[PDB]
Amino acid sequence: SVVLPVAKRGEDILKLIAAPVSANELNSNWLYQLADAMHATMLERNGVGIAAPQVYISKRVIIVASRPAPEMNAVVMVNPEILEFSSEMCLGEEGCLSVPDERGQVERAEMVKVKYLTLQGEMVETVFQGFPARIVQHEVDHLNGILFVERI
Amino acid sequence: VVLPVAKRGEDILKLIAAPVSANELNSNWLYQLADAMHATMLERNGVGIAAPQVYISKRVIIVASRPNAPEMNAVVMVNPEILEFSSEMCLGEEGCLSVPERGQVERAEMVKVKYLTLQGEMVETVFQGFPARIVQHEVDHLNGILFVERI
Ligand SMILES: O=C(CSC(=O)[C@H](Cc1ccccc1)CC(F)(F)F)c1ccccc1
Ligand SMILES: O=C(CSC(=O)[C@H](Cc1ccccc1)CC(F)(F)F)c1ccccc1
Numbered sequence: 016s017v018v019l020p021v022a023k024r025g026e027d028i029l030k031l032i033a034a035p036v037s038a039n040e041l042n043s044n045w046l047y048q049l050a051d052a053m054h055a056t057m058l059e060r061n062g063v064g065i066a067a068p069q070v071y072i073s074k075r076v077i078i079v080a081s082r083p084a085p086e087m088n089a090v091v092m093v094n095p096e097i098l099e100f101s102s103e104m105c106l107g108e109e110g111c112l113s114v115p116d117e118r119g120q121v122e123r124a125e126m127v128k129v130k131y132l133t134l135q136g137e138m139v140e141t142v143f144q145g146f147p148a149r150i151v152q153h154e155v156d157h158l159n160g161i162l163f164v165e166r167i
Numbered sequence: 168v169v170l171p172v173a174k175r176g177e178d179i180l181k182l183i184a185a186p187v188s189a190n191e192l193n194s195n196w197l198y199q200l201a202d203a204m205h206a207t208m209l210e211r212n213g214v215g216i217a218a219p220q221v222y223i224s225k226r227v228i229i230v231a232s233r234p235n236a237p238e239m240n241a242v243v244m245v246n247p248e249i250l251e252f253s254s255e256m257c258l259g260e261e262g263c264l265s266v267p268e269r270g271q272v273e274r275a276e277m278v279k280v281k282y283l284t285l286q287g288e289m290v291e292t293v294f295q296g297f298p299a300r301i302v303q304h305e306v307d308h309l310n311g312i313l314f315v316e317r318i
C-alpha cells in the first residue's frame with residue numbers, strides 16, 4: 016500500500032469544497048485504489064479518520080476509524096451527507112493531521128445520522144454517537160473547506 | 168473510468184499542484200490515476216491533460232499529440248519541470264477541456280523538459296512546435312494558469 020503526502024494548514028486545497036464522486040467512478044479500481052492509499056496513510060500517521068482533500072484529492076471520500084478512544088471497524092464513505100445533527104452537544108479535544116501540534120476543544124453534535132455510498136455504490140444510513148460522531152463531523156468539514164481551528 | 172472535469176471558475180484549477188512523492192512511483196495507485204486521466208483525455212478528444220483538471224492536485228500531465236499535427240505516443244510525465252524556454256515564439260490555436268472558447272496563444276517554439284516516468288526513471292527531453300505548446304499548457308495547469316490568462 017502507498018502512504019501519501021498530507022497537505023498542511025496554509026495549503027489552499029484544504030479550503031475548497033470537494034467534488035462529488037461521479038457515477039462512473041463507483042465500483043471502479045480507481046476508487047478502491049484511492050481508498051486503500053487513504054487508509055494506509057491514515058494508519059501510518061496514527062489518525063482515526065481521513066479525508067481525500069488531505070491527500071490533495073478534491074473528492075468527497077472520507078474514512079472514519081476510531082481506535083486507541085473506542086474501537087470500531089473502519090468505514091469508508093463516498094459522498095457522505097449528514098441528514099441530521101443532534102441538538103445535544105459534546106466538547107472534546109481534537110487534532111488534525113493537517114494541523115501539526117495544534118490541539119483545541121470543539122463543540123460537536125453528540126449524534127449524527129449520515130447517509131453515504133460504499134465504494135461499490137450502495138446507499139447506507141448510519142447513526143453515530145460520541146467520538147465517532149466527532150470524527151464524521153471533522154471529516155465532512157474537510158470536504159467543505161473547513162479546518163477545526165475555525166470552530167474553536 | 169472517465170473522470171469528471173473541472174471547469175473555469177472552480178478554485179481547484181487555480182492552485183499550485185503538489186509534487187508526486189517517491190512512495191507513489193511505480194504503485195498501482197499512480198498507474199490507475201494515469202490510466203483514468205488517459206481515458207478521460209480520449210473521451211473528451213484532447214491531446215493533453217493535467218491532474219488538476221480531474222480534481223487531483225498533483226503534478227502529473229499527459230502529452231498526446233495526434234492530427235485534428237504529429238502523431239506521438241501518449242507520454243505520462245510526473246513532476247515535469249521546464250528547464251528552458253527558447254526566446255523564439257510561435258502562435259497556435261489552443262482549447263482546453265476546462266474552458267469548453269478557443270484562442271490563439273503565443274508559446275515558446277521549443278522547450279527542454281525534465282520529468283519522472285511512472286516507474287520513477289528521471290528523463291530529459293526537448294519538444295518542438297505543437298507538442299511543445301501542449302507541454303506548456305499542461306505545466307501551466309499545474310501552476311494554476313488557464314490559457315485565457317495568456318491572451
Ligand atoms: O491521531 C490523531 C491525529 S488527528 C486525527 O486523527 C483527525 C481526526 C479527528 C480527531 C479527533 C476528533 C475528530 C477527528 C484526522 C484528520 F485530521 F485527518 F481528519 C488523534 C487525535 C486526537 C485523538 C486521537 C487521535
Ligand atoms: O480537444 C481539443 C480541446 S483542448 C485540449 O486538447 C487541451 C490541450 C491542448 C490543445 C491545444 C493546444 C495546447 C494544449 C487539453 C487540456 F486542457 F486538458 F489541456 C483540441 C484542441 C486543439 C487541437 C486538438 C484538440
Ligand SMILES: [Zn+2]
Pocket residue numbers: 110111112113153157
Ligand atoms: Zn483533520
Ligand SMILES: [Zn+2]
Pocket residue numbers: 262263264265304308
Ligand atoms: Zn487545459
